[PDB]
Amino acid sequence: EADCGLRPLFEKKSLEDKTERELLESYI
Amino acid sequence: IVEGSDAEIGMSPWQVMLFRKSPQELLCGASLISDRWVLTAAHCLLYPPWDKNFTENDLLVRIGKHSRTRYERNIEKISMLEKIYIHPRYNWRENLDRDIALMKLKKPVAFSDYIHPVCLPDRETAASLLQAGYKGRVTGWGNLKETGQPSVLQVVNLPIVERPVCKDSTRIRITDNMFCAGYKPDEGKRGDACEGDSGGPFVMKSPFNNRWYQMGIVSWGEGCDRDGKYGFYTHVFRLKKWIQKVIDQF
Amino acid sequence: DFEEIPEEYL
Ligand SMILES: *[C@@H]1O[C@H](CO)[C@@H](O)[C@H](O)[C@H]1NC(C)=O
Ligand SMILES: NCC(=O)c1ccc(Br)cc1
Ligand SMILES: NCC(=O)c1ccc(Br)cc1
Ligand code: NA
Ligand code: NA
Numbered sequence: 001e002a003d004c005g006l007r008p009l010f011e012k013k014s015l016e017d018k019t020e021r022e023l024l025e026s027y028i
Numbered sequence: 029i030v031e032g033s034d035a036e037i038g039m040s041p042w043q044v045m046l047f048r049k050s051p052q053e054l055l056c057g058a059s060l061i062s063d064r065w066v067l068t069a070a071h072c073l074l075y076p077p078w079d080k081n082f083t084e085n086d087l088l089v090r091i092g093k094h095s096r097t098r099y100e101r102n103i104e105k106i107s108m109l110e111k112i113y114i115h116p117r118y119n120w121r122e123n124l125d126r127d128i129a130l131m132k133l134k135k136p137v138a139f140s141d142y143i144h145p146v147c148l149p150d151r152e153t154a155a156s157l158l159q160a161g162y163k164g165r166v167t168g169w170g171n172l173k174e175t176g177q178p179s180v181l182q183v184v185n186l187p188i189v190e191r192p193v194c195k196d197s198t199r200i201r202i203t204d205n206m207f208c209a210g211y212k213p214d215e216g217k218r219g220d221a222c223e224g225d226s227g228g229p230f231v232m233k234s235p236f237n238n239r240w241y242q243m244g245i246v247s248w249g250e251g252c253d254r255d256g257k258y259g260f261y262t263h264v265f266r267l268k269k270w271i272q273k274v275i276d277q278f
Numbered sequence: 279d280f281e282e283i284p285e286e287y288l
Contacts, residue, residue, distance in 0.1 A: 001062060001145070001147075003144075003145075004061075004144075004145045004146060004147035004148075004239065004240075005146055005147035005234075005240040005241060006144070006238075006239055006240075006241030007038055007039070007144060007240070008038060008041065008140070008141040008142075008144055009036075009037065009038030009039075009041075009055070009141050010038065010039070011238060011239070012201065016063060017036055017039050018036065019165075019185055020047075020233055021034075021166055022159075022163060022185050023163045023164070023165065023232060023233050024235055026161060026162050026163040027157065027185065027235050028087055028161070028162075047283075049288060050288075052280050052282070052283070053279070053280065054280075087282075090283075097279060097280045097281055097286070098281050099281045099283050101284070106283060106284075106287045108287070227279060
């Protein structure tokens with residue numbers, strides 16, 4: 001649980017997936 | 029998933045496939061919330077109108093997958109079920125209110141680049157992020173159109189819809205344990221879950237702590253990707269007290 | 279439609 005929601009191939013490497021920015025841009 | 033795209037490798041490491049042992053087939057999606065607990069929709073396990081009432085021994089969960097049909101040797105992990113728990117007030121008679129179930133695995137699954145749990149929301153994350161217009165992400169191996177099947181996991185981002193619009197789209201009684209998501213006809217963009225996606229996760233990436241949270245469970249829709257219809261999702265936060273009670277007791 | 283899984287899981 002302490003490490004939940006942090007993906008090894010993305011957040012843990014500071015790599016972004018191809019569409020997560022679409023989500024961020026909607027959080028106005 | 030209709031009008032989605034292929035997932036990236038490791039994009040949804042909490043995604044779980046519910047798999048029928050015999051005949052061998054996809055039943056539903058699901059999600060990994062710890063090394064021994066998997067979250068899904070209750071209707072994936074119990075739906076008397078369709079003579080559906082699975083027991084533990086009928087099912088397997090497959091974790092770490094990308095390909096729908098392949099056995100992904102050295103990547104996926106297959107787990108047997110110790111026990112199924114369905115919300116005691118799940119309403120299969122009327123509207124799938126409280127459409128939630130937990131599955132405890134017989135042995136803990138080892139985490140990897142491909143296998144990692146999603147977070148469940150606290151009250152504040154839910155209040156902040158469950159707002160009309162805010163987008164979440166739905167993933168699954170279900171059909172690509174209502175009337176066909178994907179090679180690999182599909183992903184689509186969809187906006188949460190205002191509750192009055194959700195209610196006015198359907199004759200089904202909508203409850204506070206549900207929310208709906210999808211584009212409106214005038215928005216142009218499209219997308220939806222479809223048959224085989226139910227029980228999988230609707231996730232949002234918190235902009236406060238950069239973690240993924242499971243806000244919904246793919247629950248029901250009338251058709252797939254129809255104009256003026258929306259997909260309905262179990263409101264995970266609203267059912268958190270039951271989730272916690274189950275994990276604490278068992 | 280699906281590739282057979284290892285017998286150990288069945
Ligand atoms: C589902 O099956 C279980 C096990 O056979 C049984 O205990 C339960 O009463 C059934 N539920 C319904 C609604 O038929
Ligand atoms: N007999 C159950 C039934 O007619 C039903 C219809 C729509 C939903 Br959503 C859930 C259940
Ligand atoms: N019959 C279409 C279908 O299975 C469906 C399930 C869940 C959502 Br959300 C949207 C559609
Ligand atoms: Na209505
Ligand atoms: Na629609």
